[PDB]
Design a protein around this nucleic acid. Sequence first.
RNA 1: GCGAUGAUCACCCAUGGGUGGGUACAAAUGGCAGUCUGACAAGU
Lengths: 203, 112, 121, 36, 23, 143, 228, 153
Amino acid sequence: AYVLTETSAGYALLKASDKIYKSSSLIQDLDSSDKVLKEFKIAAFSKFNSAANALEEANSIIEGKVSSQLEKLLEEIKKDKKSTLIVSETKLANAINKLGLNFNVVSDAVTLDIYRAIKEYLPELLPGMSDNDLSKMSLGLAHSIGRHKLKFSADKVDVMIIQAIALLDDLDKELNTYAMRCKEWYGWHFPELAKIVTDSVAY
Amino acid sequence: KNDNHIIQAIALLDQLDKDINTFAMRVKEWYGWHFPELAKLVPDNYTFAKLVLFIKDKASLNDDSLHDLAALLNEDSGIAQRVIDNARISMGQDISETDMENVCVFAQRVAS
Amino acid sequence: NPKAFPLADAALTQQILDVVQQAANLRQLKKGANEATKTLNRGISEFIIMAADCEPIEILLHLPLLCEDKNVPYVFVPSRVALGRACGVSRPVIAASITTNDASAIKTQIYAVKDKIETLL
Amino acid sequence: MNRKERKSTILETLMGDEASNKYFKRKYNEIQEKST
Amino acid sequence: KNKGRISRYLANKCSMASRIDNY
Amino acid sequence: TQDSNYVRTLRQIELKKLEKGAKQLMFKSSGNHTIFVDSREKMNEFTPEKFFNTTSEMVNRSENRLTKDQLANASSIMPKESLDKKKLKKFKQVKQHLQRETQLKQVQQRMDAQRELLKKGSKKKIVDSSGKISFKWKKQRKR
Amino acid sequence: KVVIEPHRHAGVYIARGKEDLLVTKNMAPGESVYGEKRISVKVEYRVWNPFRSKLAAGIMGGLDELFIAPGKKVLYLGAASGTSVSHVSDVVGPEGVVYAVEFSHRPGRELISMAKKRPNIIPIIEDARHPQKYRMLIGMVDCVFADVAQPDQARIIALNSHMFLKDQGGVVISIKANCIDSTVDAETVFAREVQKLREERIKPLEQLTLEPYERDHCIVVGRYMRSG
Amino acid sequence: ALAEQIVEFAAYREQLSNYLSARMKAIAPNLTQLVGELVGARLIAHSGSLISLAKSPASTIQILGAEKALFRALKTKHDTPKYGLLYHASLVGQATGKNKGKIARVLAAKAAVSLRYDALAEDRDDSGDIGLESRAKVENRLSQLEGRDLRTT
RNA sequence: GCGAUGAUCACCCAUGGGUGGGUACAAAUGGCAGUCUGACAAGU
């Protein structure tokens, strides 16, 4: 059986010995550990690319639909005319039932055992495909998904406008004092010009 | 025998150093809104303004980008590879192109 | 789920407008959205009645936020013309505020609608 | 003079001056005893 | 102590140098 | 002598002073903490000393119930009489802010009563049998 | 001038100076996130407020086993405006990680600002009722805290604990009788929600009513045993 | 080279002011239709956040600028200041005297209304409709107040 | 192998540090510090 799994670093697919009885054996024999994750280490992995907006839209299509990254992961899963795969989303389950490769999928069944245990020993799956820490990855991806889930018109930023008007005031003050500086220094050659003109820019 | 050139030179150098650090920390704020880990990675304000001018946007991370941003001061401090990894996995807020041009012109102002 | 949060049914709306007239008669109700914000800042508004048919809902949607800040509940009326009529004034008020006064003979009524309003929220 | 003693009122620097303070309280107790 | 001595010494020498650079 | 504007300014002044003070203060807890035990024999031998692995004062103080392995005011001058006086002094200043705020609320309420009575209405002065004063406005829509 | 005393839980302390205070460390130095005052003793410390964060009132109210440690990970459900997720980020430090979840919009924006300030906070603007909608973002939490104001509190915590807690996990909940029943006694309310946690397999070790700081409020602390 | 620095500062400050006008039109377009980009950003900078300014009532917006004279005069029993920050709007500049006072009142109130719309409009077409219609309202009140005279004919 | 071009002139622990103080700059959602009134106005 297959297990499709979502992580902040990619899309991981696992083989298991034919499932529901494998989930049962996991939960009754306490298989949250490295031994069981080496019995089911990896079957088929895919990184998504290094584009933040693209991976944000990718998690949005994970929440809603099925995507082309899922196609290029799901191109050669089947060996015969019947292949089973376990997921935890029911709408995504029926979506990959009505998908073109038409392999049979199980919805959110009792394999919370499977998903919770391979998420517990996902640190053992990290020497498999993702030789890094996924904490800052989940940090950045969660920030991007929140940033999209709230509307976030990118032109309406109050801290930007307040920093901008503050810096406008600072540039006015600095222009005035450097104006006085260059005026008194150029008083060495032209005090009459310095008194008869008043504009810093014209000076 | 004139000496006010020396005097105004002292005064203008003092004011100039003060305005350098103020406008450079303002560059630091204006690009820490887009990438705060740049402000956590490179502490030098002058090289910060130059690095903002080069990395306008944190999306353009290429191997030639590694090369020219390593020609920007160095490789041995790990700044190039570390800032490419941090701008790849950055949580920084995206801004508009007018804000971007504003921040780059401000960093050019700091450099000049 | 629109932004028009709690809006009562017909009989409930009727009875709060009746406490609106009796508090306006006993001078226990203040008038206006800016004045309602003022007594919110004062800490003497006991609860808030607002409209739904204003230009637009937002200038009185600024009030529920401070309501949840200063734990002072609120509800909506469908007609601001009806709200100004229970206020007893020629112009349609869109936001009115029931204040606090310990020597008020209608306080049992206000604490009653307070129970009903909290069960609505 | 100072920075941590640079204060915005000469009355306030008179109260900061302690010899004037004890001089004032001494002569004040004196003349209030003379009054009472 | 000798820091102040060095300061006074350099103050006298810088006074003489200010004199010669002024006149 | 004084008006609603100045007393309202004072009201906001001292309410924000109360808010900062009550944010600064510290209140000891008193709750019905209950522990849920599996077995009735462990109920019968249940002792807070063994359960909290504490001491006597450590179990009477619900704040600092430190473990005995973690066990395993004299820095300030006059500890037994002056620091407690300072804490109790801060507490009394908060209480006095409360009292002056309520007295000032009474001033403001009487002044707004006189102001509204002078302001507007077709009024009928009613006396209530506790010696109290009130005014009944006639029922009329103001234009 | 101000003595610091380390409390029995790792990460929390007590300031004994002119005033007694319950304090924690700071992660953003010189940055009060909601207006509370900070002290320098030097190491920078920030005090907790019970009325603003009942979590501060619980450890002040007496708590046996608090499952939020420095080297741990905690989920926060009902993170309205973050005034407590900042403090739990301070108590877990860099080693720990807190996942704040909140549905509403403007406290969500405050929470994004606070997650910008603090990397220990991970933001989830996704709804708490469906955990599969954000199952990608959070992985195998050690302890969970609930401050949500919904009547299906033990049920939604049962979903989040089944899907997101590790075995032998920690479940700590704030429960409000005025929100769920508002007509019957607080004690039978708390007994009934204990029975609900027992039906949802949470084994409750203790509970504490929050009488001097709030009104008719309870915190419950329990272990999550025997789940896969 | 110093004069080069100066003219570069001046040109950059002019470009910055144009960028600020664009930013204010992007953030609060109805406030740009009502009171002005500069004074709107000044009210924003005083209040801090736009949500805080929407939380603030109308009298707070009217006397947001002269808080010193406000709290002073309320403390020592004098006339409360009546313009604050919004005096530098072109409308109050065009007004005169007690006309300035009444236009300050109605302009603070209308700016509070349309500012609340701008701050709490989750969807917003960014056209300028509410600011334009409220500005026409203030224009009509201004023309009525200017037509109302004081000396007997 | 001298000198007017200038001789000489707060604590604790044993030539080390802590306290205390003074000098310039920067930050504070640190304190001073508290956001006016509210139904009528104008012509007939």
